[PDB]
């Protein structure tokens, strides 16, 4: 766990598409936190960020769109 | 739920000095100012029952404090309710 905890301890993020891509399926769905290894605090922040990133077409909603 | 500066004006009015917070006068005053302000909220937000649960807590808290002060000193009580126009 503690290495993934460091990913949360370092940063809280939106607009870093390069890091967001670490936590999405190719079909555009959010990865569940247990698979990411990250703590739930950061999972919420990531989900909120992804939702904003989808709104501005930075990330797709699906595979197709 | 109040600006530090409105709080500062109120405590510098009703309080003993800047070291006083929470003398009964300070409390009932800032509590009253909050209650006055929230009339504007509920005048729009009729259906905000979960917010008004806090308002009911506040007006009853005001009543409890006033009644304590009334039995502790009628002079402080009467001049304070005079200044705030309370028992309106």
């Amino acid at each position: 766990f503690c290495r993934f905890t460091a990913e949360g301890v370092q940063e809280i993020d939106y607009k870093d598409i390069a890091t967001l891509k670490n936590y999405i399926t190719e079909s555009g769905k959010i990865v569940p936190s247990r698979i990411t290894g990250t703590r739930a605090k950061y999972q919420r922040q990531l989900a909120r960020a992804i939702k904003r990133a989808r709104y501005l077409s930075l990330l797709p909603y699906t595979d197709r769109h | 739920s109040l600006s530090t500066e409105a709080t500062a004006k109120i405590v510098s009015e009703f309080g003993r000095d800047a070291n006083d917070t929470g003398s009964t006068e300070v409390q009932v005053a800032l509590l009253t100012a909050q209650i006055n302000h929230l009339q504007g909220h509920f005048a729009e937000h009729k259906k905000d029952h979960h917010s008004r649960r806090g308002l009911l807590r506040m007006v009853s808290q005001r009543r409890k404090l006033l009644d304590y002060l009334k039995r502790k000193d009628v002079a402080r009580y009467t001049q304070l309710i005079e200044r705030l126009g309370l028992r309106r």
Partner: protein
């Protein structure tokens, strides 16, 4: 006053008037005695899915600390100005001055 991010996108075929837009909105900010801590453009940039049947639209960011009032003015100016195809306003915790990762990639 409230810090904000304001982030918005402009039609590729109106991207040339974007400097004029930065004038109009920055003049609203300073004319409100508000202040600005970032202004950025990321050019024409491709869209993960089509917006208004378009592609490649032009992206813009501001970091700001204006009084709430004028944010609703410029916000409603976005619904008036069809060259802006989307906008998002965020009541961010702080003024922030370090460039967007969209710039820092350069």
């Amino acid at each position: 006053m409230r810090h904000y991010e304001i982030v918005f996108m402009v039609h590729p075929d109106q991207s040339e008037q974007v400097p004029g837009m930065i004038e109009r909105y920055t003049a609203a900010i300073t004319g409100a005695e508000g202040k600005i801590h970032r202004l950025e453009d990321w050019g024409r940039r491709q869209l993960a899915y089509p917006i208004n049947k378009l592609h490649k639209a032009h992206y813009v960011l501001m970091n700001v600390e204006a009084p709430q009032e004028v944010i609703d003015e410029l916000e409603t100016t976005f619904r008036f100005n069809d060259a802006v195809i989307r906008s998002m306003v965020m009541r961010t915790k702080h003024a922030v001055t370090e460039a967007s990762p969209m710039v820092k990639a350069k």
